[PDB]
Amino acid sequence: TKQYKNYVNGEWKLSENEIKIYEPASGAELGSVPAMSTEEVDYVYASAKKAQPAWRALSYIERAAYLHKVADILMRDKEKIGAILSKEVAKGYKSAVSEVVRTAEIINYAAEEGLRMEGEVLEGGSFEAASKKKIAVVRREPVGLVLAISPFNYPVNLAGSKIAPALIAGNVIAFKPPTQGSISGLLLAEAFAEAGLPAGVFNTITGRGSEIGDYIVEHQAVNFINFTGSTGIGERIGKMAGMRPIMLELGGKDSAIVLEDADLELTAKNIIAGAFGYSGQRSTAVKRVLVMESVADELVEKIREKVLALTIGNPEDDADITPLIDTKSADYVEGLINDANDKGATALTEIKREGNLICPILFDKVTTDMRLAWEEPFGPVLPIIRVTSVEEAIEISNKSEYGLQASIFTNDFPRAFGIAEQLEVGTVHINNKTQRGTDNFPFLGAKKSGAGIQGVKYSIEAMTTVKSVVFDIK
Amino acid sequence: TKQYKNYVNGEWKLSENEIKIYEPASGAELGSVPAMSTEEVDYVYASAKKAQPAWRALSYIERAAYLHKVADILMRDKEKIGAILSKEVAKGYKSAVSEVVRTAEIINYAAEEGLRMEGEVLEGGSFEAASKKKIAVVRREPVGLVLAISPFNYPVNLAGSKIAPALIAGNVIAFKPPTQGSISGLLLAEAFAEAGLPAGVFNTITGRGSEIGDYIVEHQAVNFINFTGSTGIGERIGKMAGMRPIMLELGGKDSAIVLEDADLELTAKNIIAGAFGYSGQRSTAVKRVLVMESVADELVEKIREKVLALTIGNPEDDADITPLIDTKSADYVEGLINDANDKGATALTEIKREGNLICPILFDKVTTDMRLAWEEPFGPVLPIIRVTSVEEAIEISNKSEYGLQASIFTNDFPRAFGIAEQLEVGTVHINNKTQRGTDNFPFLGAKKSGAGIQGVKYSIEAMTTVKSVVFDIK
Amino acid sequence: TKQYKNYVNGEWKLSENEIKIYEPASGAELGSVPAMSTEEVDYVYASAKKAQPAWRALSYIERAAYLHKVADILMRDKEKIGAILSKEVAKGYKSAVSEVVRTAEIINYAAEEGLRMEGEVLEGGSFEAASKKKIAVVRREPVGLVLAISPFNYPVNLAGSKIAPALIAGNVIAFKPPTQGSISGLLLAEAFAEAGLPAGVFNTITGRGSEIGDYIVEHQAVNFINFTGSTGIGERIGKMAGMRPIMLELGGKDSAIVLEDADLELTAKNIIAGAFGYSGQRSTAVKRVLVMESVADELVEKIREKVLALTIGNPEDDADITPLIDTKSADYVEGLINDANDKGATALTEIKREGNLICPILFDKVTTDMRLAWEEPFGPVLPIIRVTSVEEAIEISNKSEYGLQASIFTNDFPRAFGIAEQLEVGTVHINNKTQRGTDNFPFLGAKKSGAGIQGVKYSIEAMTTVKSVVFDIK
Amino acid sequence: TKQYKNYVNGEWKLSENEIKIYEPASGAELGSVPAMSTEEVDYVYASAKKAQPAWRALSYIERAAYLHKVADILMRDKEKIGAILSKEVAKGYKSAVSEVVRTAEIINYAAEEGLRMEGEVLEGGSFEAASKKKIAVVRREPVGLVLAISPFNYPVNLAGSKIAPALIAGNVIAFKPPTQGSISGLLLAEAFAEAGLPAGVFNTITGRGSEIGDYIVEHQAVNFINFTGSTGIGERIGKMAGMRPIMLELGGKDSAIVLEDADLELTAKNIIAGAFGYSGQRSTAVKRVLVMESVADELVEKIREKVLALTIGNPEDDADITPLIDTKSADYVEGLINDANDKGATALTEIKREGNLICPILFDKVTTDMRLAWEEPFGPVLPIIRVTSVEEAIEISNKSEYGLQASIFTNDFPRAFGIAEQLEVGTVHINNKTQRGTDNFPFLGAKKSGAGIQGVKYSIEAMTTVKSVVFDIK
Numbered sequence A, B, C, D: 001t002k003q004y005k006n007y008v009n010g011e012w013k014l015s016e017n018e019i020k021i022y023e024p025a026s027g028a029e030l031g032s033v034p035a036m037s038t039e040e041v042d043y044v045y046a047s048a049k050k051a052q053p054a055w056r057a058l059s060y061i062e063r064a065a066y067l068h069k070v071a072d073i074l075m076r077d078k079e080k081i082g083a084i085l086s087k088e089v090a091k092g093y094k095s096a097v098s099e100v101v102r103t104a105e106i107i108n109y110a111a112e113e114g115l116r117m118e119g120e121v122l123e124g125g126s127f128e129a130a131s132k133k134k135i136a137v138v139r140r141e142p143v144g145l146v147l148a149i150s151p152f153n154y155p156v157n158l159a160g161s162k163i164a165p166a167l168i169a170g171n172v173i174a175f176k177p178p179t180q181g182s183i184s185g186l187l188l189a190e191a192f193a194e195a196g197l198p199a200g201v202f203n204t205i206t207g208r209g210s211e212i213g214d215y216i217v218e219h220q221a222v223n224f225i226n227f228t229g230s231t232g233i234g235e236r237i238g239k240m241a242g243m244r245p246i247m248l249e250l251g252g253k254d255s256a257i258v259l260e261d262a263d264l265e266l267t268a269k270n271i272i273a274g275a276f277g278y279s280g281q282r283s284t285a286v287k288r289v290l291v292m293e294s295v296a297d298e299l300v301e302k303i304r305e306k307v308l309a310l311t312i313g314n315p316e317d318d319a320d321i322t323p324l325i326d327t328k329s330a331d332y333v334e335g336l337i338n339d340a341n342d343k344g345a346t347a348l349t350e351i352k353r354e355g356n357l358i359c360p361i362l363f364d365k366v367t368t369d370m371r372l373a374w375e376e377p378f379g380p381v382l383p384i385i386r387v388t389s390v391e392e393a394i395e396i397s398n399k400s401e402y403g404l405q406a407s408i409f410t411n412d413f414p415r416a417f418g419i420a421e422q423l424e425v426g427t428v429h430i431n432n433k434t435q436r437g438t439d440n441f442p443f444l445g446a447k448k449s450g451a452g453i454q455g456v457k458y459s460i461e462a463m464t465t466v467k468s469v470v471f472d473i474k
């Protein structure tokens, strides 16, 4: 049980009810996190709004100082946190430690990027002569209270990516980690507690995403909603937000276009690492291959042999393929598998499920009439759709309701660049698997994949507004 | 009747049903505008989405070229359009002509500002050594189809402010003017038709905002909703938008803080011109004076004498105070007047209504318990709230549900600048009435006053997204 | 004779002495331009400094207005000016007209780019907590009087490229065109005169570059020296400038690296148009080919056949190859030709000179020991240096004392991009002949090729300074 | 003697000849620094140019890493270094330690500011339709070898301010500290040595500024000259630089304009701290007061009483006023004192010199005909010039050959802002003594006060160039 507590207004607090967390792989009970009540949610928010003024009052240098202390601590206790996070979400140990490190990176980067964010002075004379002596001194300002909600696959990394950019600007935070990953989320909160930030500046909220979900978003105290999860909730949040600003990173069905002149080995390598990373439980993974027929056979054989080299097993053993987050999920994946299989798809690797451990499947001959060709599995299954023209590949790629990223494997760069302009995605990688790729670059998604632009700098601009003082020079 | 038609996919079209427009002041019938059906709305949208690709294909120089042609034509026919616009919304002739001119200005400014909007190149090495040879070539892109909805008080000016920034970037437009101001809105469309933009690039939609309102917003073809109107609809739009981007300029209750060291004459002059402009039918007008008691009496007397100099009458006569847009409105204002009056407010000028022509009223001694102290009238009524400290004035100012702009009349600039940081508004004017002030400066509103940042440059960034091509340098 | 006059302080003035100008090709006398005295140079400068304050006082919109009027006029009289410019510097008619048009473009572009140049607001708190309430409002300002000196090959285009960016910012100008091209330079001044700019804002200075050269540069009234010419003068100017800012575009020996995978036809086409443009009298022309041995033979044959298609003759006949600016020049070129020839080079096309008309020569087998391999001819002679490795080509390319631009013809873009980082030039073109390429892009040169960065935006920043007002917010 | 060595290509080296350094106050021998020969200077430069390529090859993150290590070390040994620096240049102990701290700050700030410096992508279509598919990927690059020369009053602070911004960008350094301050300069080099930067990246050059001065600047290996010292040498450097880029911070005679509505107490406080800081041995000190007659008497009395409170004595005792750097200097100051005195100035405080310790003098009634009214003393002497109009004060202020900074003490900010536009300085402080003010703000000087813009960000842009790769999208 252990009984983890929330960090609220400078204090750790338990609740009348709890939620027991178990290890997706072994089944062991890791502990229990609070099941907050709306009354409690109200005190978190009240504490934050109360403390916002004086946080804003601090200097950027001082706020950046705290953020650095937090990241330092994270790096210190990276193995401790990694060991648990690994267990809580069935992620390989080493990989789980990496998540803690990349979080420290994002926190530090966000800290330094935040104190170098500047304003602008505008001339009335640029618009009309009569206003030549009129100027506008424009400076940025925080939006207020920011609600951050991280996903199960990156409960820590995708939490700091919201927390740090928000805090450096002068906003206050209310962190709501995923229930499955709430211990890890609270382990992160420990870092913010030790760093010593003023009481009320950083707060956590745990509990039944059903019991308190809509409540926390609809609350009038929240000025900005920063979320990462499924399209379904993202959509609800967009409506519950009203006219309040939001940042949403929803799902994705990232394609990998392979032209006739591509480096099939370089391509097979990138597609495997992208498609099967974390058992396909990544929104930015390569979810479908649109390969030109003439090179389909050769490419597919490479991918096939490469799949046969992926280790399958337990987190503690750093297996490439580990048990999916839960049964509801592994079942869903199983559905997509069958449907494709039934419709004629060709599994080049063995279809087999051990509990919630689904072995990596390579389906060749997948078609547009299969669910696997469009629906986001979030499991180790990769469909290969054979096209006969770059024109068709673009058409099929754009058809998807999603638009996170895309990949183009070719040697003709001017072409790759031209295709890239046509793909309805946020980012196109020319010769490399899709990845968030250094958190300094902008990250965004077209269509149902989200709302808003991410990346340290863009996150900071998003969660800030502008105040403009205009005066006349004598 | 005349029977004005919509501009759809390069053609002017009537509908089975029409809506007759009458002059707010005289009552004369100006003509009739189409009452579209959802079937028709579907063709407007279908035409636009069909034409978007090739508009995006053009060069910025070519798109900017068309926009300049439009503005040229507007300047040419400024009297023609002004004469009607003046009649349709009871605006003074000269002033109505100014609206047409300022629209040409915004269109030209948006055209040149648009072709100088550039991208950025990012270094993988700024984040992590291992990615030093990885770069991100980031360029802007249009969002697609943009729905522009202008208000009755600026059916033309607040239409071009959305249309031009949107088109230069590569977006297509579906213009929906207010029913009262739909002839003027269609007069503007004539300019876009003569300019010769490709068919489907610019389109108009007219009809019962009730019969087709939600339909046009909720339509899945619309990628961005740019609106200007009441808070009530703005709120509906924020929900109907879902997770699609929006720009909303709602209401306002702009305060004018007058400190003990202010230039009472300079102040009285600015407050009058702000408060009584267009009979108070401006979202950015000075709607409440928070004056320090020690100078309240003197200041109020100046304002009083100045009010007595405002001409009252008909549009064609360029009267300062003209008939309110309609009866529903003049009634609402009458309500606020009585309530304040009943509660003890002191009308320093005569309360009198002739049809829909309400004479300018100056209410001294207004208090927090009066509706006039918080609700946006949109009529010629100005409340004077006497405070006893800058601290109180800030408190009362921030209490309002609105946050468009504010004014501070003082000589202590460092103070004015400090106060400005505390006011929950988008812009603070130090010694001058609130105004949009040269459409190149950013324009935004805090709280219920809106969502998004305006001003030519900011409008262009808002209705654009970003595509990021990442590659590795060998 | 005609007897052209200088435009000084709003008036056209002749001088006691004149300089007669003759047509490089026919020999006819075009007319005569003033041979100013230092006394007269002092009045030009005194007029400018006197008028600077009130030009700065105008609004950007007003200054941009004048600049547009100038460009309009240029476009109007493009044939008139083109006809003479063509004769004065032995440039093809059509091409000379193009120069006038591109000048109008640069003037308009500079005008609009100039009124959108903005300032910045900085936070004391970004550096140290104790200064959190301290801010710096930074705005640009003009440097004052700018001296612009254009070259003979672009007496008009390379004059406006300095004049427009300088004037829009608030600086005043003293234009000194090349003696051979001074009629065309004065023809441009006519445009600035008709546009009606205030007296003293724009002024011309003509005369013996020997008699008045150093005098005009060393004068204490000049705040910035913007020059385009030979390395020799550029160097003198750098010393005579002292610690005053300068912009220098000197010579160049641009290489064109051709890798084994290049499109030899696309390459031969680009190299010909670059190398033989204006008879090689372009600083940005392809002056040496560093081709990989394996493709040297095939490539060279294409270039050879293509050279044989270049028309040779008179300006009025739009010949590809026209008479060189003068005898001193054609002689120098003849020297380089012989030396190479003597040393073993292989002329694949006929060596022949008719007066000052040297026919286009293609020298294969040129080596490092030849003058043609390093010295800038400024005549229609192209050396082909055969290398055996990209490593060698880079080495040979960088050896040159020049560094304007370079070209890489290959299909391996990541490679091209990697090579580009190693080349000591200002710009690298991947698959295309070197060109200034749209005057919006930055233009600069490494090593002896210059000092400063050009391109409309960069030119504007160069000829401006910054004023920073710092104050404390209460 | 100790016998300090230079840090050259990763090694510490003595020279055949040395220069013995003595403590300005006590006279004690601190030690001896090398007196290099041009042969040695050639090896420093050869080492640097040799190592430049691979330093540029590193990632920004790695270069920033080294810079942070250096600053950490400086903070560690701040007392050690402070103790000596205090002795070497007669600076108060505590103050000397502050110099070491502020250096660490600038080094760290420069490190983080450097890795967030980005490029831009330009559109051919912004200029001309035909080039719409042409784009320019512009990225920054280092200039190469940078020569940094620090002053005696900041041998360390004004060295790091050049070193850090230069190194983070990819340049190599050759540090030349002032002879009087060369031990401290070499103490700084120790930090760069311990940090472990690659050999040849950072180097020091010491020796007779006469014996090797021009040699080190004129050397063809140096690509950029960054200097801080007297106007005399600055001017020589501007000529010896040729057309190579430079950064020069020369002298100053900063005025403090005091209007009739100023806070005389707040003003007297700021003027004393600025004027008498480091015995007036600061280029940014308040060197002349231009006060409106009506408040001259009252203001002057405050300043007078405040002067009487300044401690006078030895460095180790943290005296406000310590011995001037040397006799040649104290003599020069004595000259200015007498001249003014002879001409009628009125010393309100005692004129007295003890060796090289000149007591702080306040001269009222100074006039334009006195040397003290224009010449930069660099000693504790403050002239009060009484004016009768803001117009006159501006006139007198601008008359000076210098233009570093200025101060305006008034309550009328719009006026202060208007005056500021007229003052020929780089920075204007409204109500506060002149100061460099947080090294993140831009720092520059008008007229003979320098060439180039400083401040961490601006320093980085200055010592960098731009490479532009242009290509066509298919």
Ligand SMILES: NC(=O)c1ccc[n+]([C@@H]2O[C@H](COP(=O)([O-])OP(=O)(O)OC[C@H]3O[C@@H](n4cnc5c(N)ncnc54)[C@H](OP(=O)(O)O)[C@@H]3O)[C@@H](O)[C@H]2O)c1
Pocket: B149, B150, B151, B152, B153, B154, B158, B176, B177, B178, B179, B180, B207, B208, B209, B210, B213, B214, B217, B228, B229, B230, B231, B233, B234, B236, B249, B250, B251, B252, B282, B283, B284, B378
């Ligand atoms: N700068 C400005 O112009 C400015 C600033 C602030 C506030 N305003 C507003 O201008 C308003 C005009 O009066 P109003 O009460 O009629 O406000 P409003 O309904 O918000 O008017 C604005 C626009 O809303 C349209 N509309 C109504 N329902 C719709 C819906 N369901 N979905 C989409 N569009 C719909 C109207 O067309 P129809 O007229 O046919 O219904 C009109 O084009 C004022 O009340 C004031 O708040 C203007």
Ligand SMILES: NC(=O)c1ccc[n+]([C@@H]2O[C@H](COP(=O)([O-])OP(=O)(O)OC[C@H]3O[C@@H](n4cnc5c(N)ncnc54)[C@H](OP(=O)(O)O)[C@@H]3O)[C@@H](O)[C@H]2O)c1
Pocket: C149, C150, C151, C152, C153, C154, C158, C176, C177, C178, C179, C180, C207, C208, C209, C210, C213, C214, C217, C228, C229, C230, C231, C232, C233, C234, C236, C249, C250, C251, C252, C281, C282, C283, C284, C378
């Ligand atoms: N087209 C280009 O943009 C382009 C680009 C790169 C290089 N170039 C250069 O154009 C050059 C043409 O030869 P050039 O003889 O014209 O070279 P140049 O004399 O150095 O340059 C010509 C310009 O400088 C003036 N000038 C000469 N001596 C001067 C001095 N002492 N001080 C100030 N100005 C002085 C000339 O007037 P005068 O007529 O009286 O000499 C003319 O206006 C080539 O060598 C080439 O390097 C042109």
Ligand SMILES: NC(=O)c1ccc[n+]([C@@H]2O[C@H](COP(=O)([O-])OP(=O)(O)OC[C@H]3O[C@@H](n4cnc5c(N)ncnc54)[C@H](OP(=O)(O)O)[C@@H]3O)[C@@H](O)[C@H]2O)c1
Pocket: D149, D150, D151, D152, D153, D154, D158, D176, D177, D178, D179, D180, D207, D208, D209, D210, D213, D214, D217, D228, D229, D230, D231, D232, D233, D234, D236, D249, D250, D251, D252, D282, D283, D284, D376, D378
């Ligand atoms: N804030 C400040 O730091 C600041 C600001 C403005 C003005 N100042 C100036 O600082 C000066 C203090 O130094 P100073 O009086 O000796 O003046 P200075 O010589 O101009 O400046 C000293 C620096 O210049 C070096 N140097 C001398 N001749 C050189 C040459 N010809 N080529 C290259 N470098 C050379 C010196 O070497 P050596 O010392 O070995 O001769 C030393 O590092 C004062 O005159 C004052 O006007 C300081």
